[PDB]
Design an enzyme around this catalytic site. Structure first.
Site, PDB file in Angstrom:
ATOM      1  CG  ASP A  89      17.529 -27.458   4.569  1.00 25.53           C
ATOM      2  OD1 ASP A  89      17.116 -28.390   3.762  1.00 25.53           O
ATOM      3  OD2 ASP A  89      18.539 -26.844   3.933  1.00 25.53           O
TER       4      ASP A  89
ATOM      5  CE  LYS B 250      24.077 -18.197  12.173  1.00 27.47           C
ATOM      6  NZ  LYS B 250      22.995 -18.430  11.373  1.00 27.47           N
TER       7      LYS B 250
END
Lengths: 178, 61, 325, 51
Positions: free
Chosen positions: C204, C115
């Site tokens: 979320d 990442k």
RNA sequence: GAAACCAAAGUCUUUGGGUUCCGGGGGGAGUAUGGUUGCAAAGCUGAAACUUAAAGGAAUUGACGGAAGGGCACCACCAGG
């Protein structure tokens, strides 16, 4: 009935003569207190009477005239009558750092600033009024604001240049729920 | 207890974004008790409010 | 690709030293903090500008160089190569909005996922915000993996890069049908209660942050948004995530729930919301450090005279004046 | 007396041992800096180039 | 007077009232070495080799403030569609 007398030094006589009507009027109107100036004893003598509305109005007046005598402007000192929490914490300039002669004069200098600018800048940020008697610093404001102000003034007399001082105090002002 | 109000003067705009109006509140309970409150929305001088708590006093000093 | 593997390390790291303190770093400072080779670093900078490694800045008075987006990326991979984690590049890349996913391969040939944070105020601040993002994400990744959670395995972190376990699948948003909807639903509902048990709310927890592995195993990624259960609206963010999953399985797979988990359990698990006397050998080292500092200070003042741009501008006008007279 | 006097004389002997030890280090660093100054100035004249 | 400033820092290229000390690009270095004084810590005196195009003093505009005050913008926010 009870009384409180507060002294007045010779340098402060002529303002007390000029501002006299601006002084005794708020003391006698909405506080309702007897007030005179004993020229023999050089004291502002204030009293309660039959027309005195409430207790502790004597203490309001006592603080008001005291503030004026220390050097605070009448319009600024008047705040002591109307507001609850305002105090005048005062300290000697030599309390923070032992300073002699020319060093003390520069020390006074940098509390004030050029054109009194530093003095006013702290007064703005700390929401106080500060007064420099020759070797005394009298400050007037809320307790939280006084403790802020006493630190900035203090840093200035123990060295820290005005530039560093403003930076420190504006960070402190941001955290104190101003 | 629910108390009704008046508007004596519209002072300025408080709040972060300029959303709250600082307003002088006279009481409709005959008393000249002037408490400064913060209102959300449009308020003109001469409005009558419905305050949920009257004991509260908004940001003075 | 990475061919040059000597002087490129020292020069690019020297930029990163100046980037933490100041905006655009002058070429005078670079050579002083990279003292191993002297003089020939200016041609290295001209090779760095060929690639997207550094950018030149000559505005008005400020003359120097700043590190780019891609240039910051190469520095992390160069550090991961020395730790023997990255060797060759895999091509399956999912280019996102906040981060880029790069497939990496080690010495063994085992494929891992990398990442790279691409936060996009000046570029100096943007490449500093990406530093704090990876260190925060790796902190949660270690905290969850140790506490039985089905997350990718943390391997190594370098500035903005995070190496994780390669879990290959499809995100929940682009799934047509699941062979067993009920078992998948109960697995996902358990993980919200699991996080709440450890004193965490996802915030979320949607279909956009969940990946299925062969339609059997639910994988969780992306953790910078996580909040404490000490928050006043703790049950609100808890119930919103529950209703998001409740409606989704009824919408996409037409599965109605029989179990309604609304338990507040804080905390039965670990609170993860926080997450002659002096010897001559020493004398030699101390004398060396003094003598290097005297030389480094003198080299700084020699490099500060490079102004070359100021002399070039003054020469152009003088030729025009003499010709006109 | 004798209790205070011996205690003070012990601290005097600690400091006397200390500034002898400090002077010894001052000559040790001075002798090591001066020989490293020569060995660095030696490189300037000779043994610095290419071929 | 480079000047800030200075009735001295003036009466200096229209240069000489007497007289003592002392500086000669910056470093190396107020370091070594010798001498001398010192109970010691140290003081006084005191280099070179070598290295460097400068080291600096006054003044002046304000590119930048991570300085402060104002003012403005749904290519900003607030209440909303």
């Amino acid at each position: 009935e009870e009384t409180r007398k507060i002294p007045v030094p010779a340098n402060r006589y002529t303002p007390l003569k000029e501002n006299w009507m601006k002084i005794f009027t708020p003391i006698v109107e909405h506080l309702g207190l007897q007030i005179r100036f004993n020229l023999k004893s050089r004291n502002v003598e204030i009293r309660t009477c039959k027309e005195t509305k409430d207790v502790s109005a004597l203490t309001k007046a006592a603080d008001f005239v005291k503030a004026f005598i220390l050097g605070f402007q009448v319009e600024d000192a008047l705040a002591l009558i109307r507001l609850d929490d305002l105090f005048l914490e005062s300290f000697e300039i030599t309390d923070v750092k032992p300073l002699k002669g020319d060093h003390l004069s520069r020390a006074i200098g940098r509390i004030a600033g050029k054109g009194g600018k530093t003095k006013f800048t702290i007064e703005n940020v700390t929401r106080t009024r500060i007064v420099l008697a020759d070797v005394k610093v009298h400050i007037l404001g809320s307790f939280q604001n006084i403790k802020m102000a006493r630190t900035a003034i203090c840093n200035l007399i123990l060295g820290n240049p005005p530039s560093k001082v403003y930076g420190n105090i504006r960070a402190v002002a941001s955290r104190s729920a101003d | 207890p629910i108390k009704l109000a008046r508007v004596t003067k519209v002072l300025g705009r408080t709040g972060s974004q300029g959303q709250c109006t600082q307003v002088r509140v006279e009481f409709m309970d005959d008393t000249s008790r002037s408490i400064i409150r913060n209102v959300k929305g449009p308020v003109r001088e001469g409005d009558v409010l419905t305050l949920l708590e009257s004991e509260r006093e908004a940001r003075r000093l | 690709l990475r061919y040059m593997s000597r002087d490129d390390f020292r020069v690019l790291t020297a930029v990163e030293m100046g980037m933490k303190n100041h905006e655009i770093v002058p070429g005078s400072l670079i050579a002083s903090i990279a003292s191993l080779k002297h003089g020939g670093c200016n041609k290295v900078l001209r090779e760095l500008v060929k690639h997207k490694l550094i950018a030149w800045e000559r505005t008005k008075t400020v003359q120097g160089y700043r590190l780019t987006n891609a240039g910051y990326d190469y520095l992390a991979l160069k550090t991961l190569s020395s730790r023997q984690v990255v060797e060759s590049v895999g091509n399956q890349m999912g280019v996102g909005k906040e981060s880029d996913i790069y497939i990496v391969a080690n010495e063994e040939g085992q494929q891992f996922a990398l990442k790279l944070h691409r936060l996009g105020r000046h570029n100096v601040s943007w490449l500093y915000l990406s530093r704090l993002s990876a260190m925060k994400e790796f902190a949660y990744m270690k905290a969850l993996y140790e506490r039985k959670f089905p997350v990718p395995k943390p391997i190594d972190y370098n500035r903005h890069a995070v190496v994780m376990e390669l879990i290959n699948g499809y995100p929940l948003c682009q799934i047509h049908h699941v062979e067993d909807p009920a078992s998948v639903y109960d697995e996902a509902m358990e993980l919200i209660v699991k996080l709440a048990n450890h004193g965490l709310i996802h915030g979320d927890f949607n279909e956009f942050n969940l990946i299925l592995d062969e339609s059997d195993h639910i994988t969780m990624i992306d953790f910078p948004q996580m909040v404490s259960t000490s928050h006043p609206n703790a049950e609100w963010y808890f119930d919103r995530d529950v209703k998001c999953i409740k409606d989704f399985f009824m919408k996409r797979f037409s599965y109605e729930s029989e179990l309604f988990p609304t338990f507040k359990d804080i905390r039965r698990e670990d609170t993860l919301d926080v997450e002659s006397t002096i010897p001559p050998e020493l004398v030699k080292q101390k004398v060396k450090r003094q003598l290097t500092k005297q030389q480094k200070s003198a080299v700084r003042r020699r490099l500060q005279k490079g102004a070359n741009i100021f002399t070039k501008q003054r020469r152009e006008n003088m030729q025009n004046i003499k010709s006109s007279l | 007396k004798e209790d205070k006097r011996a205690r003070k004389q012990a601290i005097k002997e600690e400091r006397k041992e200390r500034r002898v030890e400090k002077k010894a280090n001052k000559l040790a660093f001075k002798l090591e800096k001066r020989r490293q100054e020569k060995e660095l100035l030696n490189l300037k004249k000779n043994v610095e180039g290419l071929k």
